[PDB]
Paper text:
Growth/differentiation factors 8 and 11 (GDF8/myostatin and GDF11/BMP11, respectively) are two closely related members of the activin/inhibin subclass that share ~90% sequence identity in their mature, C-terminal signaling domains and ~52% identity in their N-terminal prodomains. Similar to other TGFβ ligands, GDF8 and GDF11 are disulfide-linked dimers that are initially synthesized as precursors, which are cleaved by furin-like proteases to separate the N-terminal prodomain from the C-terminal mature domain. Similar to other ligands in the activin/inhibin subclass, GDF8 and GDF11 predominantly signal through the type II receptors, activin receptor kinase IIA (ActRIIA; ACVR2A) and ActRIIB (ACVR2B) and the type I receptors, activin-like receptor kinase 4 (ALK4; ACVR1B) and ALK5 (TβRI).
Our new apo-GDF11 structure, solved under similar crystallization conditions as apo-GDF8, adopted an exaggerated “open” conformation such that the fingers extend past the horizontal plane. The previously published apo-GDF11 crystal structure adopts the classic “open” conformation with an ordered wrist helix that includes the additional interchain hydrogen bond between Q62A and the pre-helix loop observed in the FS288-bound GDF11 crystal structure. Taken together, crystallization of both GDF8 and GDF11 in their apo states reveals intrinsic structural flexibility in these ligands.
Numbering used by the authors:
A (entry chain B), B (entry chain A): 1 to 48, 71 to 109
The structure:
């Protein structure tokens, strides 16, 4: 398979990956220590039914408080869109 | 500029980003606690300088020992190839 990577304001119409930064403190996800922000990206474009959606995801390593007075470092899956495709 | 994202054995001749897993444990980089391996990717393909090279990079968050008996969590830049292009 083949994926496409675009900038914002590109003229590509096909299903493409675009940049997007997620900001945990902006949503009040207070229990996260780091990172406070990260580039998650997102998918958009014509698939002409099938739609443009993540076909590959990658993890990020996070430092956060849990429910049990612990601080966790852990690899959290499914956090970054690595590729977009029609499905 | 538009980037392409390939699987291994894709048959694409153009400049494209391919998957690649870096394994710190395999190279004995013993000051790194986590992650022991991660998806860095790489760039390969024809550009008809111009050479197929990374054009966007992403960090990873790492846990490691330093020179001063300390354990460090930090955002390490330039660790993941996010986009490949001809330049």
């Amino acid at each position: 398979n083949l994926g496409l990577d675009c900038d914002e304001h590109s003229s590509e119409s096909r299903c493409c990956r675009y940049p997007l930064t997620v900001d945990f403190e902006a949503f009040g996800w207070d229990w996260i220590i780091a990172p406070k922000r990260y580039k998650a990206n997102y998918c958009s474009g014509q698939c002409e039914g099938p739609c443009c959606t993540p076909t590959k995801m990658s993890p990020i390593n996070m430092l956060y408080f849990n429910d049990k007075q612990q601080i966790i470092y852990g690899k959290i899956p499914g956090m970054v869109v690595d590729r977009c495709g029609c499905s």
